[PDB]
Design a protein around this ligand. Sequence first.
Ligand code: NAG
Lengths: 179, 49
Amino acid sequence: LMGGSALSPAAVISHERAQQQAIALAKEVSCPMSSSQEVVSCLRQKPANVLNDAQTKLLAVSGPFHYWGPVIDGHFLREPPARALKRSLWVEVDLLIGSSQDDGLINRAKAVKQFEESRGRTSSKTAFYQALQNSLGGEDSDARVEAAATWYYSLEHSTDDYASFSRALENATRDYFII
Amino acid sequence: TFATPWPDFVPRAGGENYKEFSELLPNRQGLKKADCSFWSKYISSLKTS
Ligand SMILES: *[C@@H]1O[C@H](CO)[C@@H](O)[C@H](O)[C@H]1NC(C)=O
């Protein structure tokens, strides 16, 4: 496993987010919102370019919990993995694991910025960092942890420059999503 | 010309100088700036909120 875990806090998005994230998708293109069988029955015949347009309009903000990802299902995941890593013993597989130092979620969104620079949205960068800062605490965005951790990496200078604010944000996400 | 020239405590970033009473009497810069940002900036937001 290179630069990743089975315990990182985006590996299992939940029904509160995954159902919301497709509701957020159907608002972008002119698709009807009726039920589960109608938010798929437009998308089962969309062209493959305009549906990947609606990913870039949506993933450029809202951060890592609003990424698309795995969901707990009863035939594939009995439990979220923090408990389920202790619920699976007596299986033998060696582990060679490790991250890089360059693995930032700005760096994992380098190709996301390119289409945002193409049409041109300078507000899709300053809204991206705070939405990443919104995700910097818990999954429920508790202020008691978000104000606690924003002291420890010392990034309360989102005022004039993006020199120290853009670097120390990458410091903070990498030591909670990666390492 | 008796010891090292003491610089005054400039109350600003890039300053806050002091004197360490050792054999050479050197000029350090910033005492416990990690820990006096802990009790003064972290907890001062935790106590009021
Ligand atoms: C990020 O981490 C590195 C680790 O060596 C550290 O040197 C650097 O100062 C950190 N970035 C910021 C902006 O503090």
